[PDB]
Amino acid sequence: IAKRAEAYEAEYRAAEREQIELARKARAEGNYFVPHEPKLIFVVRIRGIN
Amino acid sequence: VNIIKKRTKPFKRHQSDRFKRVGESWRKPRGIDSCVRRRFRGTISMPKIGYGNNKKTRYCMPNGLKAFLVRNVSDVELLLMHNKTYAAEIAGNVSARKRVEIVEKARALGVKVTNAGAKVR
Amino acid sequence: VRELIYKRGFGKVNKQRIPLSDNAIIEAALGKYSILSVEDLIHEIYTVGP
Amino acid sequence: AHVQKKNPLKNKAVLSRLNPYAKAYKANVKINSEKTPKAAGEKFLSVLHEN
RNA sequence: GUACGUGAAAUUGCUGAAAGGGAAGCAUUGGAAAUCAGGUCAGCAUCAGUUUUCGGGGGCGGAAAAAGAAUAAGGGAAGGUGGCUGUUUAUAGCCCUUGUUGUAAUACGUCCACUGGGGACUGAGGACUGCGGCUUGCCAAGGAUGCUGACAUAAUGGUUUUCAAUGGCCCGUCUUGAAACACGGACCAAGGAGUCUAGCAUCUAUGCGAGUGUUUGGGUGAUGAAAACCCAUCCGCGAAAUGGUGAAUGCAGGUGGGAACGCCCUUGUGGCGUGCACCAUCGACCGGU
RNA sequence: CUGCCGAAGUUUCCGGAUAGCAGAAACUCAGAUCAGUUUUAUGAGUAUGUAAAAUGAGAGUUUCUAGUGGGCCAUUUUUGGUAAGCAGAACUGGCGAUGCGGGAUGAACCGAACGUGAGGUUAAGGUGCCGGAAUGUACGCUC
RNA sequence: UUGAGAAGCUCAGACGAGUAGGCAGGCGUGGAGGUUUGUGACGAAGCCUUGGGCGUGAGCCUGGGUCGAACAGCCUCUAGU
């Protein structure tokens, strides 16, 4: 479990760094890098049952 | 586990105060327009099972003992093993002579008596 | 995602709202999919795994 | 079992139970070390400061 | 004390206590006064749960903030300064671009399994199990303990009356989508409305079971004999149907699913055998079996 | 006296049955089917109907036995209109069986749906005083 | 570990308006059979009470007073409840 958690956290950091480098290179090149479209959504119900 | 009471007031019947012919004993209002039945603003409360008390402390006196009605000495000996759970309560129709026998025997068994001083003094 | 599962995370076990208080609860209910701990459950939700 | 729910985000002992990895995390890390390479395309700056 | 057992309520007089500025009753929370039961009530600490409120430190992100400052180029001018209304840094300066100081800082966004305080509420459970941490043990790790006080000639918890603040439309009946009308209600006590019986049906229980049902009657019953106990002959319903006749062809028939059981071996699964009830299927036998 | 479950509020045929909604009894079914839902595909006219992934939930029948068969209000489409009202449908909503916060007060407005409590935080509406909460901050308009 | 009134004990989660309707468990009253070595003139029943206690409730128990001859718990039966 410790090794899996270490792998997952390293994956999160690598993905965050990768997205930031990808944006920086496009900005330096003058090009546009679209981010990945989110796969996960969190939905909160704000209105009651009436 | 102290004795906790969810409520101390009784549940008086609606309009029992205005009319003497209407006793204070709780009666479920059957009128389909009874404002108190509908639980409007400021209305008096109605008995609910949620008002029920903790099963562990239910039926227990403030001292933590449950009252057990006792008619003669034989009932007192029945409380030999439950003196930390039960308190003897001498019946109203038990005469003065039997009360002194009940109280004295209860003292020997170490059993609390709820009304030990009645008709005995 | 991590704070929701740690603080407000409850699992449906035997149709019962059992809190995610131990890793064995998640392992017993999601070990068939190799989700052994809370961090594995967080990883599956966050990355939207299979 | 589990008479009371303890929050790992507040109870360190419960977090250690759930995650046998939090003891070695090191959240704060020098990543922008050495020098900061200002990376801003001149084309990008022109369109940004355009109109 | 015959206005005679017990002596309720409505209601009345009296005394006591209290309230009262065009209603009252009531509910909630406490105060006061009176009165009851008779361990109680506090302060702090260390923790657990929920929560609120202040800070500190540090990552990362964006124009890898924008500025800005300091310092080198060039450009432009003004809401024109010194100078002389007009002009171009001089005896004020400003704007634009670039370099530099730079990896500047800061703000904002985000993160810390980073951290320091203040406040409130809660303490369920009740030998030991478990998951963990530090090292047999110890622990903030499957729910509060520890250290003291004070006080019982009172505090707490009540109860009664009353006040304060807040809320509170008269009950039932009827009508309508719904109200409101409208009808009943001066007050109290006592009485006062789904009952017994015959039939039918359902369901449950009980006894027996191809049977079943003693109580028309008889026998019998000394202690209440209208009970209980016993049962000859009949009869009721059922066991045979169909419109006079009147039923295993075929383990009282095969196929599939199926309760339950058995044997197995990839053993679990799945295979094979047996297969109640019940339901679809081919089949019969009597005028339903 | 307390507790639990809990409608219909109306089709479809001649006041009755059928069905619907609610329960009970007895079955089979979890390598299964459902859904007041959305996608995908097919055609056909932004919608339609038909079929086949997402999400959720264990999903099915049989018997038999209660109660119900109204209305009111509102939106939208549409049919006509008329000094102007409105009149006629359809549509699903809200009430109806239901308290509570707010709207000074209220059958139809805004929130919200109910065991007994302690704490925390909000919705709608609010923060001069009555009245709990800023005689707050910033920019205007108005006599 | 004693916690088998198995009709008992224990663990866990969810839920809580409610008319018509459906279902369940309880409180109380007169009388009957059984039972409590039951209560009682040293005071039954009843009544009264700003006494106490129990139950969500129907209701129950008890102190004090008055009172003067009978009454109750439990299990079942019954109803002019």
mmCIF file of C-alpha atoms (C1' of nucleotides) in Angstrom, chain F:
data_model
loop_
_atom_site.group_PDB
_atom_site.id
_atom_site.type_symbol
_atom_site.label_atom_id
_atom_site.label_comp_id
_atom_site.label_asym_id
_atom_site.label_seq_id
_atom_site.Cartn_x
_atom_site.Cartn_y
_atom_site.Cartn_z
ATOM 1 C "C1'" C F 1 -53.376 5.095 24.337
ATOM 2 C "C1'" U F 2 -49.080 4.307 21.356
ATOM 3 C "C1'" G F 3 -46.694 2.377 17.027
ATOM 4 C "C1'" C F 4 -46.196 0.815 11.643
ATOM 5 C "C1'" C F 5 -47.805 0.945 6.383
ATOM 6 C "C1'" G F 6 -50.408 4.384 3.575
ATOM 7 C "C1'" A F 7 -53.571 6.101 -1.113
ATOM 8 C "C1'" A F 8 -56.854 7.471 -5.013
ATOM 9 C "C1'" G F 9 -57.892 11.983 -5.990
ATOM 10 C "C1'" U F 10 -59.734 8.546 -13.075
ATOM 11 C "C1'" U F 11 -58.808 5.959 -17.341
ATOM 12 C "C1'" U F 12 -61.454 2.018 -20.250
ATOM 13 C "C1'" C F 13 -66.551 -0.616 -20.997
ATOM 14 C "C1'" C F 14 -72.095 -1.034 -19.794
ATOM 15 C "C1'" G F 15 -74.738 3.130 -10.987
ATOM 16 C "C1'" G F 16 -71.749 -2.246 -11.640
ATOM 17 C "C1'" A F 17 -67.147 -3.914 -13.608
ATOM 18 C "C1'" U F 18 -62.008 -4.153 -15.334
ATOM 19 C "C1'" A F 19 -57.576 -1.539 -14.822
ATOM 20 C "C1'" G F 20 -54.590 1.981 -12.000
ATOM 21 C "C1'" C F 21 -52.616 3.427 -7.256
ATOM 22 C "C1'" A F 22 -51.867 0.271 -1.370
ATOM 23 C "C1'" G F 23 -51.216 -4.094 1.193
ATOM 24 C "C1'" A F 24 -51.351 -9.298 2.275
ATOM 25 C "C1'" A F 25 -50.626 -14.745 0.954
ATOM 26 C "C1'" A F 26 -48.080 -18.215 -2.068
ATOM 27 C "C1'" C F 27 -44.403 -18.885 -5.874
ATOM 28 C "C1'" U F 28 -39.287 -17.870 -9.419
ATOM 29 C "C1'" C F 29 -35.958 -15.237 -9.896
ATOM 30 C "C1'" A F 30 -29.492 -12.375 -8.871
ATOM 31 C "C1'" G F 31 -24.343 -15.414 -16.038
ATOM 32 C "C1'" A F 32 -31.907 -10.803 -14.375
ATOM 33 C "C1'" U F 33 -34.160 -7.721 -15.487
ATOM 34 C "C1'" C F 34 -36.210 -3.002 -14.843
ATOM 35 C "C1'" A F 35 -36.320 2.864 -15.152
ATOM 36 C "C1'" G F 36 -41.620 9.709 -15.234
ATOM 37 C "C1'" U F 37 -33.463 9.585 -17.243
ATOM 38 C "C1'" U F 38 -29.708 10.698 -20.790
ATOM 39 C "C1'" U F 39 -26.690 9.223 -24.922
ATOM 40 C "C1'" U F 40 -25.564 6.212 -29.821
ATOM 41 C "C1'" A F 41 -27.477 4.316 -34.393
ATOM 42 C "C1'" U F 42 -31.207 3.733 -38.028
ATOM 43 C "C1'" G F 43 -34.747 5.886 -40.940
ATOM 44 C "C1'" A F 44 -38.583 9.350 -41.468
ATOM 45 C "C1'" G F 45 -40.879 14.492 -40.604
ATOM 46 C "C1'" U F 46 -34.974 21.712 -34.290
ATOM 47 C "C1'" A F 47 -38.479 17.960 -32.736
ATOM 48 C "C1'" U F 48 -40.476 12.703 -34.077
ATOM 49 C "C1'" G F 49 -40.800 7.260 -33.913
ATOM 50 C "C1'" U F 50 -37.664 2.592 -33.786
ATOM 51 C "C1'" A F 51 -33.363 0.024 -31.994
ATOM 52 C "C1'" A F 52 -28.841 -0.393 -29.226
ATOM 53 C "C1'" A F 53 -24.242 2.241 -24.416
ATOM 54 C "C1'" A F 54 -24.363 5.549 -19.628
ATOM 55 C "C1'" U F 55 -26.353 5.921 -14.655
ATOM 56 C "C1'" G F 56 -29.362 4.013 -10.876
ATOM 57 C "C1'" A F 57 -32.002 0.055 -8.433
ATOM 58 C "C1'" G F 58 -32.221 -6.960 -6.893
ATOM 59 C "C1'" A F 59 -35.723 -7.460 -10.412
ATOM 60 C "C1'" G F 60 -40.321 -10.473 -11.621
ATOM 61 C "C1'" U F 61 -45.104 -12.365 -12.004
ATOM 62 C "C1'" U F 62 -49.989 -14.952 -9.945
ATOM 63 C "C1'" U F 63 -54.028 -15.126 -6.812
ATOM 64 C "C1'" C F 64 -57.511 -11.566 -3.295
ATOM 65 C "C1'" U F 65 -58.986 -7.139 -0.603
ATOM 66 C "C1'" A F 66 -59.671 -2.693 0.970
ATOM 67 C "C1'" G F 67 -60.259 2.530 -0.064
ATOM 68 C "C1'" U F 68 -60.585 6.073 -4.418
ATOM 69 C "C1'" G F 69 -63.732 7.704 -9.534
ATOM 70 C "C1'" G F 70 -63.600 15.061 -7.405
ATOM 71 C "C1'" G F 71 -62.284 19.803 -7.840
ATOM 72 C "C1'" C F 72 -59.312 24.496 -7.306
ATOM 73 C "C1'" C F 73 -54.943 27.271 -8.913
ATOM 74 C "C1'" A F 74 -50.911 28.311 -12.291
ATOM 75 C "C1'" U F 75 -47.460 27.859 -16.816
ATOM 76 C "C1'" U F 76 -47.088 26.881 -22.063
ATOM 77 C "C1'" U F 77 -49.072 25.746 -26.807
ATOM 78 C "C1'" U F 78 -53.387 26.724 -29.534
ATOM 79 C "C1'" U F 79 -58.735 27.832 -31.124
ATOM 80 C "C1'" G F 80 -61.658 32.055 -31.689
ATOM 81 C "C1'" G F 81 -62.091 36.322 -30.640
ATOM 82 C "C1'" U F 82 -64.020 41.901 -27.763
ATOM 83 C "C1'" A F 83 -64.596 48.871 -27.151
ATOM 84 C "C1'" A F 84 -62.450 45.857 -22.838
ATOM 85 C "C1'" G F 85 -63.206 41.277 -20.434
ATOM 86 C "C1'" C F 86 -62.564 36.607 -21.708
ATOM 87 C "C1'" A F 87 -64.399 31.945 -23.919
ATOM 88 C "C1'" G F 88 -62.596 26.504 -25.667
ATOM 89 C "C1'" A F 89 -59.308 22.683 -25.302
ATOM 90 C "C1'" A F 90 -54.439 20.256 -24.360
ATOM 91 C "C1'" C F 91 -49.974 20.093 -21.099
ATOM 92 C "C1'" U F 92 -47.611 18.904 -16.720
ATOM 93 C "C1'" G F 93 -47.209 21.300 -12.388
ATOM 94 C "C1'" G F 94 -49.078 23.400 -6.918
ATOM 95 C "C1'" C F 95 -52.901 22.575 -3.299
ATOM 96 C "C1'" G F 96 -55.058 18.956 -1.813
ATOM 97 C "C1'" A F 97 -53.587 13.876 3.293
ATOM 98 C "C1'" U F 98 -48.599 18.983 5.342
ATOM 99 C "C1'" G F 99 -46.575 21.305 9.825
ATOM 100 C "C1'" C F 100 -42.174 24.955 9.626
ATOM 101 C "C1'" G F 101 -38.760 30.070 7.946
ATOM 102 C "C1'" G F 102 -39.812 34.554 5.168
ATOM 103 C "C1'" G F 103 -43.331 37.861 2.414
ATOM 104 C "C1'" A F 104 -46.263 43.628 8.324
ATOM 105 C "C1'" U F 105 -51.151 40.223 8.091
ATOM 106 C "C1'" G F 106 -52.909 35.782 3.912
ATOM 107 C "C1'" A F 107 -55.849 28.832 0.346
ATOM 108 C "C1'" A F 108 -52.727 29.420 -3.535
ATOM 109 C "C1'" C F 109 -45.636 33.993 -3.630
ATOM 110 C "C1'" C F 110 -40.351 32.844 -2.066
ATOM 111 C "C1'" G F 111 -37.722 28.806 0.847
ATOM 112 C "C1'" A F 112 -38.340 24.247 3.096
ATOM 113 C "C1'" A F 113 -40.918 19.092 3.811
ATOM 114 C "C1'" C F 114 -41.706 17.181 10.549
ATOM 115 C "C1'" G F 115 -39.480 11.484 16.331
ATOM 116 C "C1'" U F 116 -37.156 13.957 21.301
ATOM 117 C "C1'" G F 117 -32.822 17.080 22.140
ATOM 118 C "C1'" A F 118 -27.337 19.747 22.374
ATOM 119 C "C1'" G F 119 -23.968 22.247 19.113
ATOM 120 C "C1'" G F 120 -22.615 24.153 14.345
ATOM 121 C "C1'" U F 121 -24.042 26.193 9.439
ATOM 122 C "C1'" U F 122 -27.321 27.967 6.023
ATOM 123 C "C1'" A F 123 -32.172 28.777 2.375
ATOM 124 C "C1'" A F 124 -35.743 32.545 1.441
ATOM 125 C "C1'" G F 125 -35.794 37.243 3.454
ATOM 126 C "C1'" G F 126 -33.107 40.591 5.838
ATOM 127 C "C1'" U F 127 -29.205 44.156 9.298
ATOM 128 C "C1'" G F 128 -32.017 52.861 11.448
ATOM 129 C "C1'" C F 129 -35.868 51.710 15.711
ATOM 130 C "C1'" C F 130 -39.924 48.528 16.805
ATOM 131 C "C1'" G F 131 -36.474 43.448 15.547
ATOM 132 C "C1'" G F 132 -32.101 39.042 16.017
ATOM 133 C "C1'" A F 133 -28.253 41.318 12.469
ATOM 134 C "C1'" A F 134 -23.130 46.855 9.145
ATOM 135 C "C1'" U F 135 -26.708 54.475 10.976
ATOM 136 C "C1'" G F 136 -21.205 48.794 6.439
ATOM 137 C "C1'" U F 137 -17.717 49.845 2.013
ATOM 138 C "C1'" A F 138 -17.593 51.975 -3.068
ATOM 139 C "C1'" C F 139 -19.834 54.541 -7.452
ATOM 140 C "C1'" G F 140 -24.073 57.279 -9.252
ATOM 141 C "C1'" C F 141 -29.194 59.181 -9.672
ATOM 142 C "C1'" U F 142 -33.513 61.749 -7.101
ATOM 143 C "C1'" C F 143 -36.139 67.054 -3.772
#
